[PDB]
Design a protein around this ligand. Structure first.
Ligand SMILES: CCn1ncc2c(NC3CCOCC3)c(-c3nc(CC(=O)N4CCCC4)no3)cnc21
Ligand SMILES: [As]
Ligand SMILES: [As]
Ligand SMILES: [As]
Ligand SMILES: [Mg+2]
Ligand SMILES: [Zn+2]
Length: 335
């Protein structure tokens, strides 16, 4: 499949943008434009063929498209940030981190498959409000999940429930043991995307960079499953927290989107007479200080640490982040 719409010019434009598939500088917004709003289906199709995953796992191209298309329809188009474009961008970004030189020959194809799928499903059906909002407003979801990783459990539930129908089941020709290991890994990684778990995750990552063992040639030695899944769960977390590491032109659009989502929640809070969460207040929160604060406290320490694990591979990402931080600081009118 070369196009999803009526415009013949787009095949070319789409195919053009997909030349950057293996690069950090891919522009998912363009992919979205040239694919009739199917950034996730298109990107995943592209990633799977690049990695020969459909052949390696005997996934019919037809079952795959129908699954992806449906996965993608389960992202809410009326949610500013947490929609299929962010899913696409996290899938693509993980695709690039998986090919980093320092992790060469390290992961099985099942593992590579799990990480890319995890990426794709990891915010599906996101309502546009935070876990704390669902908990404080007694949502059906918080009731289902008992207030623990409410959204994350949900996203996983939806992704795997979409595989039940044979016409959608992309893992049909995996072995029971393979599916078993996939589910265990995908679950681990998506749950890892819960921000509430981030310090515990960074702590444990810092404490793997300490005992790190780069083999003679250049690649990291990860022998056991426990070290391997820890990198993957951190890679997908990085991917999700990657917007500030992209070109400024992309970071700003992402930033605009998430603030729109956050202020939509503020409005819904106010509408219900709840205490308005500070970063969700359109009347008082500085968009710019939010990003400087986000980078300084969350994104830099994570990437500073990822960059360490795989150096010098991520050095260019660190330089971009540091430049992007400074751009935002410089837009704060105060010293
Ligand atoms: C565009 C730069 N960017 N990308 C993400 C993000 C962000 N929070 C994400 C929320 C979803 O989980 C991954 C992190 C924030 C941000 N996050 C928060 C804390 C917050 O309001 N949360 C709601 C639920 C989890 C954290 N405050 O600012 C700022 N810029 C971002
Ligand atoms: As495509
Ligand atoms: As289906
Ligand atoms: As908030
Ligand atoms: Mg999430
Ligand atoms: Zn996400």
């Amino acid at each position: 499949i070369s196009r999803f719409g009526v415009n013949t010019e787009n095949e070319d434009h789409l195919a053009k943008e997909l030349e950057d598939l293996n690069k950090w500088g891919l522009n998912i917004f363009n992919v979205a434009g040239y694919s009739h709003n199917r950034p996730l289906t298109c990107i995943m199709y592209a990633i799977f063929q690049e990695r020969d995953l459909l052949k390696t796992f005997r996934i019919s191209s037809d079952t795959f498209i129908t699954y992806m298309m449906t996965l993608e329809d389960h992202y809410h188009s009326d949610v500013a940030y947490h929609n299929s474009l962010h899913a696409a961008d996290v899938a693509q970004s993980t695709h690039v981190l998986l090919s980093t030189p320092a992790l060469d020959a390290v992961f099985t194809d099942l593992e590579i498959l799990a990480a890319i799928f995890a990426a794709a499903i990891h915010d599906v059906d996101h309502p546009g409000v935070s876990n704390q909002f669902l908990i404080n407003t007694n949502s059906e979801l918080a009731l289902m999940y008992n207030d623990e990783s409410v959204l994350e459990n949900h996203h996983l539930a939806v992704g795997f429930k979409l595989l039940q129908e044979e016409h959608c089941d992309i893992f049909m020709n995996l072995t029971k043991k393979q599916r078993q290991t996939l589910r265990k890994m995908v679950i681990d990684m998506v749950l890892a995307t819960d921000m509430s778990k981030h310090m515990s995750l960074l702590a444990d990552l810092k404490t793997m960079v300490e005992t790190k063992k780069v083999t003679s040639s250049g690649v990291l030695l990860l022998d056991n499953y426990t070290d391997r899944i820890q990198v993957l769960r951190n890679m997908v977390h990085c991917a999700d927290l990657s917007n500030p590491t992209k070109s400024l032109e992309l970071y700003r659009q992402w930033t605009d989107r998430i603030m729109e989502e956050f202020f939509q929640q503020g409005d819904k809070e106010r509408e219900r007479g709840m205490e308005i969460s500070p970063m969700c207040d359109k009347h008082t929160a500085s968009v710019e200080k939010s990003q400087v604060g986000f980078i300084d406290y969350i994104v830099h320490p994570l990437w500073e640490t990822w960059a360490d694990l795989v150096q010098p591979d991520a050095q260019d990402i660190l330089d971009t982040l540091e430049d992007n931080r400074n751009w935002y600081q410089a837009m704060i009118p105060q010293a």
